[PDB]
C-alpha cells in the first residue's frame, strides 16, 4: 500500500519519543530514556486511505536516518523557551537534509496539558506561518491533539 516516511525532531526532552509511542502504542511515556534513534512501523487507514506508516524518532549521525524522511514533525515543548527557539536551526538541518526549501513539515508544541507555558500559542502560529506550515498543540500525556499532529504531517506531505 502507500508509505509515509515520517521524521520526528526537536530539542532534548520535549516529548518526541512520548509522542511517537503514544500515537503508536496508545500509551503515555512517563519516564526519560534519550532516544538514539528508534523506528515504529504502523498499518493505520488516515483518510480513507490505507497506508503504512513508518516514523523515525530521533535524538535531541541525525543526517543520514533522516535523508529518507518524507515529512518533518518538528516539536518543541510549550515549557520550554529554548526549545522553541531551537526549531530555526532544525528546520535548517532538515533543510540540508532534504536539499530543499519545500519540505513537508508540521510545528508541533508538545506538553500542553501541563502549566508552566512559557511559549504562547500566538507565537508559535506566527513562526509556523512564517514557515508556511500548520501549527498543532499537543500532549502525548493525556493524548490531546496528537493523532491529528501525525495525520496532519501526512496530509502535508499529499501536498506536496
Ligand atoms: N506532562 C507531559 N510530560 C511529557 C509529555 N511528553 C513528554 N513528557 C515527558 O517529558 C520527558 C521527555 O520525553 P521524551 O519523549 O523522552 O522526550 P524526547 O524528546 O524524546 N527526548 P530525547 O531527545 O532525549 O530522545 C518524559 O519524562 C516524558 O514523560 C507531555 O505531553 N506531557
Ligand atoms: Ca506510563
Ligand atoms: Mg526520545
Ligand atoms: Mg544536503
Ligand atoms: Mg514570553
Not at 525532531?9 to 534519550?34: C, M, R, W
Not at 497506508?51 to 549521525?61: K, R
Request: glycine residues 6%; contains cysteine; hydrophobic residues 35%.
Amino acid at each position: 500500500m502507500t508509505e509515509y516516511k515520517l521524521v520526528v525532531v526537536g530539542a532534548v526532552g520535549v516529548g518526541k519519543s512520548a509522542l511517537t509511542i503514544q500515537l503508536i502504542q496508545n500509551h503515555f511515556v512517563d519516564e526519560y530514556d534519550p532516544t538514539i534513534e528508534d523506528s515504529y512501523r504502523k498499518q493505520v487507514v488516515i483518510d480513507g486511505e490505507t497506508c503504512l506508516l513508518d516514523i523515525l524518532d530521533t535524538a535531541g549521525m541525525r543526517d543520514q536516518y533522516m535523508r529518507t524522511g518524507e515529512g518533518f514533525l518538528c516539536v518543541f515543548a510549550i515549557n520550554n523557551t529554548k526549545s522553541f527557539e531551537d526549531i530555526h536551526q532544525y528546520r535548517e538541518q532538515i533543510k540540508r537534509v532534504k536539499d530543499s526549501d519545500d519540505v513537508p513539515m508540521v510545528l508541533v508544541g508538545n506538553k500542553c496539558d501541563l502549566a508552566a507555558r512559557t511559549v504562547e500559542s500566538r507565537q508559535a502560529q506566527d513562526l509556523a506561518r512564517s514557515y508556511g506550515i500548520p501549527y498543532i498543540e499537543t500532549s502525548a500525556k493525556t493524548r490531546q491533539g496528537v493523532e491529528d499532529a501525525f495525520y496532519t504531517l501526512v496530509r502535508e506531505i499529499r501536498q506536496h
